Design a protein around this ligand. Sequence first.
Ligand SMILES: CSC[C@H]1CN(Cc2c[nH]c3c(N)ncnc23)C[C@@H]1O
Ligand SMILES: CSC[C@H]1CN(Cc2c[nH]c3c(N)ncnc23)C[C@@H]1O
Lengths: 237, 237
Amino acid sequence: MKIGIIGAMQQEVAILKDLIEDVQEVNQAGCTFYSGQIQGVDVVLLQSGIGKVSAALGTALLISQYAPDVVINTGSAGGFDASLNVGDVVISSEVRHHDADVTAFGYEIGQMPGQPAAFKADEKLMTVAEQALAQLPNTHAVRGLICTGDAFICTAEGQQFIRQHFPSVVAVEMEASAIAQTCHQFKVPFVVVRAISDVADKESPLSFEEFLPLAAKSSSAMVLKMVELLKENLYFQ
Amino acid sequence: MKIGIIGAMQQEVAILKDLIEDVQEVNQAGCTFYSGQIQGVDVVLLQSGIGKVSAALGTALLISQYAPDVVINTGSAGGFDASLNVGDVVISSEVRHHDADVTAFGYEIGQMPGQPAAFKADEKLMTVAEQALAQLPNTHAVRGLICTGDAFICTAEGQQFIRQHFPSVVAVEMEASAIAQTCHQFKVPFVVVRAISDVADKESPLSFEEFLPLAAKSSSAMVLKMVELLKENLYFQ
Ligand SMILES: CSC[C@H]1CN(Cc2c[nH]c3c(N)ncnc23)C[C@@H]1O
Ligand SMILES: CSC[C@H]1CN(Cc2c[nH]c3c(N)ncnc23)C[C@@H]1O
């Protein structure tokens, strides 16, 4: 099997990049693809750049050229769920665009015409995420709705808008819905396994830069554990 | 040369689709690609679907698989310039994301990290659009900033925010910045040549329904003239 792993920033992909054996690097359209193996499992790690367009473009190139069997989105996120602390893992049940609005034509808030209102994480991948979490007993996680937009959320007004429209939101970021929508269009299973760098408030610019490395560490540990589980999930393969 | 043409909706691509000789249709990832010739020049017409993610995904597949020499984005738009009536044409000087905001890290409003603040349309393609306009004297057009977001703009608040942050905006729509950013990442020249279906206000939903066909007609006539000029002029090898 081949696992596609996608992160936006260099800092988000660095830990996993260093684990790829027999690594081959391709640079294309602002994207970097690292292909090789982890523990005999074929992996392609994409560093896409930030935001919905970069993530969509990168994901489209990843799927069309490398044909991963599954996609895992790694990286940081801004926490909305009360129970999340900085460094904690967040897992997508589903992903929505918080900044999509075609309600004028009867679509629900966040729904892009032509798409479902939410992009559901693959149930079989989800089971692997749960298994990985069970093997990291020091790790606290929350699973729920992840909301994506092309904005860094750092104001009370920004938070309130998102909570008003998506009351179940557990975290926000800037790529997941683009990765998930792209995967939906290609019919490829995905899950988002990120970790919290900040709580999307006026302190988040500073918190983000301070704790991005921690978030990358936590997210990356989970993703590595999933790769190790996938290695011997022969029914899944 | 090979000319790439991108429209989001069925009605936006239908006029040009019907002019393609020796047409070959490919369906991939929810996109449709029609290739062949229009008046003796190779074209690939992409029906991308609506919104930034679909447009980015589609444009990435278009460029990576078909290698068009230039990209023209056709279709409808919501008018901001006071002189625009339904059916009038807008030509991009440049394109920006109206809904991007990472000002917390020093970027300009609308600027995505890792990108320039605006995506400038190609000078030769703008010239060709202006030549096409001269050959369609009963068409009124404005050249200027086109702003894109994942929302249908139809409220006073929506207009206010966009005008506040991008006061020179001439029109808004939902794909151009995705196309433009993707073309930027691939280093492929682009221009947007759209037409007005509505003026982005409370009347827009009904105006759009009524005037989408007029907007497709007006935009498509310009694009056809541009195809003819590009075949003749050798501006692009
Ligand atoms: C330099 S732009 C920030 C990057 C890291 N991202 C995830 C993220 C963490 N905190 C966030 C917040 N408060 N709002 C939105 N996104 C995030 C998204 C982008 O790649
Ligand atoms: C059914 S969604 C609208 C489709 C047609 N589009 C262009 C457009 C016309 N008027 C617009 C407006 N007031 N606000 C944003 N976009 C537009 C974008 C989308 O593909």
